[PDB]
Amino acid sequence: VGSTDQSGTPEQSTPDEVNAALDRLLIADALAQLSAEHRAVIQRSYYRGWSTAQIATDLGIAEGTVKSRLHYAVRALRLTLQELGVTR
Amino acid sequence: WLSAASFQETTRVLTDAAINCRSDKLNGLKENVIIGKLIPAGTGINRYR
């Protein structure tokens, strides 16, 4: 039906990364205020996307130890974000 | 060949460019504009830069 070179076809656009850049800045701020154990566990589950047992094998710790650290480190960030007015 | 291909006769310049295998020293106003370097003029010359 259509050809992009032909007129009358809308060109593709991609939105700006402003909202993503600001969140990444705030996430990087709240990350520094974490213990070296907690920061090195959320960055292996959400930034590296590993499994619960994969992080346990790397850090040389127990299975439930990774579960407990992630459970708090998430709430620790929610504390730091809500104290700065980050919208729920 | 980069300053010429953006002026006129794009194919005629690009054909003779690959045959003679010309290499372009990126030192010129029109060239640095394309690649994003400071133009070698005004506040871009090495004296003031």
Binding site: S3 | C21, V33, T43
Partner: protein
Amino acid sequence: KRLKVVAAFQQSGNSPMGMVLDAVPVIPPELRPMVQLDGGRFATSDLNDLYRRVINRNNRLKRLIDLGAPEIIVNNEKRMLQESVDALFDNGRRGRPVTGPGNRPLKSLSDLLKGKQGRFRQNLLGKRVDYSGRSVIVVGPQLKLHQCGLPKLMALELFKPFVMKRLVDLNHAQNIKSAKRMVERQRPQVWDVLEEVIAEHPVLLNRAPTLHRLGIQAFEPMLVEGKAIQLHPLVCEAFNADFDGDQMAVHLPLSAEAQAEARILMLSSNNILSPASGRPLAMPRLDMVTGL
């Protein structure tokens, strides 16, 4: 003239055999994108119809070679493969071009580089830029020669990241995230903050066509109400700008060097004389000369 071609192949060490291709490269897909339409159907770049025709005729030739088809079909097929690669690289160069639906010539790969719509002139010598706007220009006699009046709504969006910075400094906003929502919603705090931001931060004014370098001049912005740009009456000669519906563009220099180039090199007060002749341009011209 023959030696010019022959001597080049000898010294360089590249074989002339490259002029004959055994394989043709395919440009990555995002440079020939196929977009879906709001009617359900699709629309693809012409390069996809050219690459498809080369593939169609090249695969049919592979069948004829396997089948041992008569030399008349194989030779007449090989000819069409040559015309296909010729159309993919420069459709229309030899003979009549490959028409698409509606007798429109398809755009080949070499069409992406030629002329005003080509890659060089359209997307390399000139680009669209962030931190810029445009509106109608209106004469403002009260402005000083180094000043210009731009609308408040224009400045807020133009200086949006700078306003967001100060909104979190003065604690009008909790975080930078909510500071962005304040500018999009135009909370009353931004208008007091916006004035602090544009303080002695020069802006660039331009009117097409940009005939000489004074077609772009730097000014000190002053927040004015309304939606029109207020231009000084003396720079009208340089811009060749009358006030019968003209529009001008505004560009905001960000880096320290860019502001310094606007403050010193491009400021309207530092460019009263014409660089072509040396005679002044920002001088009494119409009502001003009659009044004097």
